Write a structure and sequence with these properties.
heterodimer, A: 14 residues, little secondary structure, 0% helix, B: SHC Adaptor Protein, two-stranded parallel sheet, 3 helices, T-cell surface glycoprotein CD3 zeta chain (chain A), SHC-transforming protein 1 (chain B)
Chain lengths: 14, 107
């Protein structure tokens, strides 16, 4: 897909 | 110098080269707007020679931490700076130490 992703604060799920 | 519009740490739509250039010391941080993701925020803060970019808003527009929430993104940067606590996200305790400086972008 993906990617670069950043993230996050938060979470987690999924 | 007023709200996200010119906050002392919110730089605005930054790039991957400029944002990383602002991290001169391990501890400086700043928030920006995800260019590829319109309507998203990010936090480029160095923890120890390893810049960490975390999205301040989750996929469902909701800023929070391992177990907390932020009524506003400005409340998030002021919450961690109030106790020098990290932000955490997916295995990275982004710790804040010194806000960079912009007050001009964000429009």
């Amino acid at each position: 897909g993906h990617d670069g992703l950043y993230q996050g604060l938060s979470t987690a799920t999924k | 110098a007023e709200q996200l519009r010119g906050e002392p740490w919110f730089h605005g739509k930054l790039s991957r080269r400029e944002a990383e250039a602002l991290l001169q010391l391990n501890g400086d941080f700043l928030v920006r707007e995800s260019t590829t993701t319109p309507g998203q925020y990010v936090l480029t803060g160095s923890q120890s020679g390893q810049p960490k970019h975390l999205l301040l808003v989750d996929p469902e527009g909701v800023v929070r931490t391992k177990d907390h929430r932020f009524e506003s993104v400005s409340h998030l940067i002021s919450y961690h700076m109030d106790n020098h606590l990290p932000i955490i996200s997916a295995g990275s305790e982004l710790c804040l130490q010194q806000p960079v400086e912009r007050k001009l972008l964000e429009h």
